[PDB]
Ligand binder design. Structure first.
Ligand SMILES: CC(C)CCCCCCC[C@@H](C)CCC[C@@H](C)CCO[C@H](CO)COCC[C@@H](C)CCC[C@H](C)CCC[C@@H](C)CCCC(C)C
Ligand SMILES: CC(C)CCCCCCC[C@@H](C)CCC[C@@H](C)CCO[C@H](CO)COCC[C@@H](C)CCC[C@H](C)CCC[C@@H](C)CCCC(C)C
Ligand SMILES: CC(C)CCCCCCC[C@@H](C)CCC[C@@H](C)CCO[C@H](CO)COCC[C@@H](C)CCC[C@H](C)CCC[C@@H](C)CCCC(C)C
Ligand SMILES: CC(C)CCCCCCC[C@@H](C)CCC[C@@H](C)CCO[C@H](CO)COCC[C@@H](C)CCC[C@H](C)CCC[C@@H](C)CCCC(C)C
Ligand SMILES: CC(C)CCCCCCC[C@@H](C)CCC[C@@H](C)CCO[C@H](CO)COCC[C@@H](C)CCC[C@H](C)CCC[C@@H](C)CCCC(C)C
Ligand SMILES: CC(C)CCCCCCC[C@@H](C)CCC[C@@H](C)CCO[C@H](CO)COCC[C@@H](C)CCC[C@H](C)CCC[C@@H](C)CCCC(C)C
Ligand SMILES: CC(C)CCCCCCC[C@@H](C)CCC[C@@H](C)CCO[C@H](CO)COCC[C@@H](C)CCC[C@H](C)CCC[C@@H](C)CCCC(C)C
Ligand SMILES: CC(C)CCCCCCC[C@@H](C)CCC[C@@H](C)CCO[C@H](CO)COCC[C@@H](C)CCC[C@H](C)CCC[C@@H](C)CCCC(C)C
Ligand SMILES: *C/C=C(C)/C=C/C=C(C)/C=C/C1=C(C)CCCC1(C)C
Ligand SMILES: *C/C=C(C)/C=C/C=C(C)/C=C/C1=C(C)CCCC1(C)C
Ligand SMILES: *C/C=C(C)/C=C/C=C(C)/C=C/C1=C(C)CCCC1(C)C
Lengths: 225, 225, 225
């Protein structure tokens, strides 16, 4: 299958991302730095396994909608289900967010992937978009809290915290919101962009939001207590 | 389908419930009130999505048992899986429960929905009831802790706490135990009550245990620190 | 089916395990002893439900690999998914492990069962072993942290803690690593050992790692604060 190379290239990059983070994580014995290193290595590990599941073709399935037999990488939702809230925890711990606010976001994130998955496998075409919309909605809630609520409390901590957060926020804020767009125009939605392009688009995005995101966070001197 | 209206009416009520709670939650910046507001809005959000999934027919499936092809809304279990422990957490935080007790209840709740679901999709008629029984059993465990162990510690806190808890306990204690009953006589079990009635019965129950429940809790002056 | 008796025997042992733990747990009102009792009872309850689901034949499924139709107790992965991380929590709470480290382990455990399941239901034979290997790899990570990281901080606490831990570690360290071996040689992998034997092998293992493990822990005077 044409996108095979993109799934390979992502399996690889996620692999190396995990291993790098795993080694870079050796000899870190601060409770706070641990937490971070822990979460930030899980994302690409989980990501790695799902990229491989897609590469080997275990993450793939045939959903009928549109009078056609459309291909749907369901693995992506299995992956995101776990990676995406972890990624949020990273941000939340950093700014020192309320037990409350975290539960809020994870809840929202859950629903977001939750509905997105439902969407992806729905057999009535127009219906899929109702799911998209609901998910897209949950996203706007995350992006809100991240942008408004978080930047407030982010700005009332150490110089290194606020800075690192701000970059990490920005990256997420931008790249995260690219996913629904891709979804919509892609084979899950309109079928405007072809699968091989969609996969590549997603593949670049994932690598960035995870390894890229991770590289920034774990490199910073801001993960410490 | 006859119950379509009940699923609509519940989608709606859960929708509004979520939105009411979402707005009512704006401008609440106490760490404790947040926690509550967060949990109590997830419930109806999750509930909203699952009611919609049933309405659109994504939460529905055909399970054969009894030499028939019986309609099972599986989405209910996907819903309850998450909503029900959250609801417990609400009660648990209110009384200031031990880290232990909470894990106890969530585990029990898990098993209750867990087996419930297993029961619901079991193809051997008599077998379903074994599952019912096991689930019904875990329920009696929660209702216990709630009634005995919780009311103890509930009673050794502020006046507003004990009061609010007591109502909330009562509401849960009564309406929660109605679910198995309905399950049993309904199309999951005996098939005495018809699906459309079952759905309405369930719909009324859900709206109460969630929005109803929530309305009470979020209105009280007892969610604060 | 030949192994029916083994699943029965396990259902039974897990049942009694649960009930014993449930009774023995009455009248324990220390926050730390609660936590432990809570987790250690969940394992066998969860275990009980999945051994029944396997006995009743709800946990079973036909996976095609090797040009044959192989039988795969998928329930095992449903069980382990939850039992195995709880088992680790028990160990981690005991030694007083970092929020970080726990999250680390649970993560690894998730991936372990995560991939194991993927493996079990994979339709390409050689493929199954790639999953095994990845899973087996996560295991080595858990066994490491348990053996190296944990024994360090374990040895810097009370005499009773270090001792009990050391036993519990050892039991886990040995018995846990038997599972992959069994998997490989069994009907999931090579199909060297027969299912009825595999089941018996697993059956003994589960009972030991759960009830046995639990009997040791809950009997000890080290679960207290
Ligand atoms: C948390 C917090 C948030 C939870 C949000 C609720 C939504 C849960 C989504 C889940 C739904 C599960 C889908 C799946 C099991 C249904 C399987 O049926 C398949 C449909 O394609 C069969 O086709 C092949
Ligand atoms: C707050 C609100 C409630 C928000 C909820 C959003 C609900 C919207 C539901 C969409 C619904 C009106 C149906 C859209 C399909 C539309 C193309 C026409 C219906 O069927 C077509 C035949 O006419 C199928 O064409 C197949 C041929 C293809 C070439 C497809 C047409 C090309 C279009 C560019 C893609 C259109 C489909 C979706 C992107 C529509 C909604 C997108 C929007 C939410 C960004
Ligand atoms: C409020 C927002 O600042 C205060 O946070 C306090 C925390 C809570 C208000 C957080 C609530 C949890 C989520 C916002 C619930 C997620 C559901 C929605 C994002 C989905 C929107 C669609 C709706 C029609 C169901
Ligand atoms: C939190 C606690 C500690 C955990 C407690 C542990 C309890 C056990 C949980 C797992 C248990 C629910 C098993 C899941 C069953 C699932 C594989 C259904 C498929 O098996 C069916 C019978 O062989 C086939 O129906 C297939 C076709 C159709 C007849 C029906 C399809 C079923 C639905 C699409 C599945 C819905 C599942 C999600 C809600 C989850
Ligand atoms: C501590 C214990 C281990 C736990 C106990 C769990 C085991 C219970 C399993 C019962 C099992 C032997 C099956 C019972 C069915 C029995 C009435 C036979 C009639 O079955 C009918 C035809 O064969 C099925 O159609 C159905 C047609 C119906 C419309 C007929 C009406 C009569 C009844 C209402 C049939 C339904 C049976 C259930 C109500 C079972 C009782 C539940 C009870 C535990 C509250
Ligand atoms: C709480 C009550 C209930 C939910 C507990 C489980 C119900 C029980 C019937 C177990 C079902 O599993 C098999 C029946 O097909 C029996 O084991 C397999 C062996 C069978 C071949 C023999 C069956 C004989 C009995 C059904 C033995 C089970 C006795 C329990 C009902 C006693 C539990 C009472 C107490 C612990 C709450
Ligand atoms: C360690 C983390 C916290 C959690 C671990 C994550 C590992 C990934 C789990 C693998 C699992 C999704 C694969 C099992 C396949 C199984 C669900 C069958 C696929 O069918 C469904 C298609 O509708 C997918 O639903 C869907
Ligand atoms: C890095 C990872 C570990 C990668 C592992 C990749 C696995 C290599 C391919 C496995 C295997 C097919 C090759 C060896 C057997 C060969 C003669 C082919 C025969 O396969 C048979 C087809 O009829 C399978 O049925 C008869 C069944 C037997 C042939 C069983 C053979 C399979 C082996 C048991 C797999 C090796 C186990 C190791 C991973 C243990 C360490
Ligand atoms: C590592 C993967 C990450 C960080 C993925 C993030 C994914 C999203 C934010 C996906 C969002 C979606 C919507 C908002 C609309 C519906 C389609 C989805 C699931 C692609
Ligand atoms: C918002 C939904 C709530 C609070 C649902 C609560 C549901 C239950 C307590 C269901 C219980 C069941 C049993 C105890 C017996 C078996 C059947 C079930 C799953 C309906
Ligand atoms: C109560 C059950 C317990 C403690 C189970 C532990 C199970 C494992 C450690 C299973 C491990 C596996 C691998 C490491 C390789 C692939 C096959 C598995 C899933 C059997």
């Amino acid at each position: 299958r044409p996108e095979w190379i993109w799934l390979a290239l992502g399996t690889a990059l996620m692999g190396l991302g995990t291993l790098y983070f795993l080694v870079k994580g050796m000899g870190v014995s601060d409770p706070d730095a641990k937490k971070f290193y822990a979460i930030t290595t899980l994302v690409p590990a989980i990501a790695f396994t799902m990229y491989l599941s897609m590469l080997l073709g275990y993450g793939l399935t045939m959903v009928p909608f549109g009078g056609e037999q459309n291909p749907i990488y369901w693995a992506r939702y299995a992956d995101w289900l776990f990676t995406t809230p972890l990624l949020l925890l990273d941000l939340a711990l950093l700014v020192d967010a309320d037990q409350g606010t975290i539960l809020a976001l994870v809840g929202a994130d859950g629903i977001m992937i939750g509905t997105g998955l439902v969407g992806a496998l729905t057999k009535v075409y127009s219906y899929r978009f109702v799911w998209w919309a609901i998910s897209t909605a949950a996203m706007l809630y995350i992006l809100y809290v991240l942008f408004f609520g978080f930047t407030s409390k982010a700005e009332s901590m150490r110089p290194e915290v606020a800075s690192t957060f701000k970059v990490l926020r920005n990256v997420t804020v931008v790249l995260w919101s690219a996913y629904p767009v891709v979804w919509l125009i892609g084979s899950e939605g309109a079928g405007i962009v072809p699968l091989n392009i969609e996969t590549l688009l997603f593949m670049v995005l994932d690598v960035s939001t995870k390894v890229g995101f991770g590289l920034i966070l774990l490199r910073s001197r801001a993960i410490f207590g």
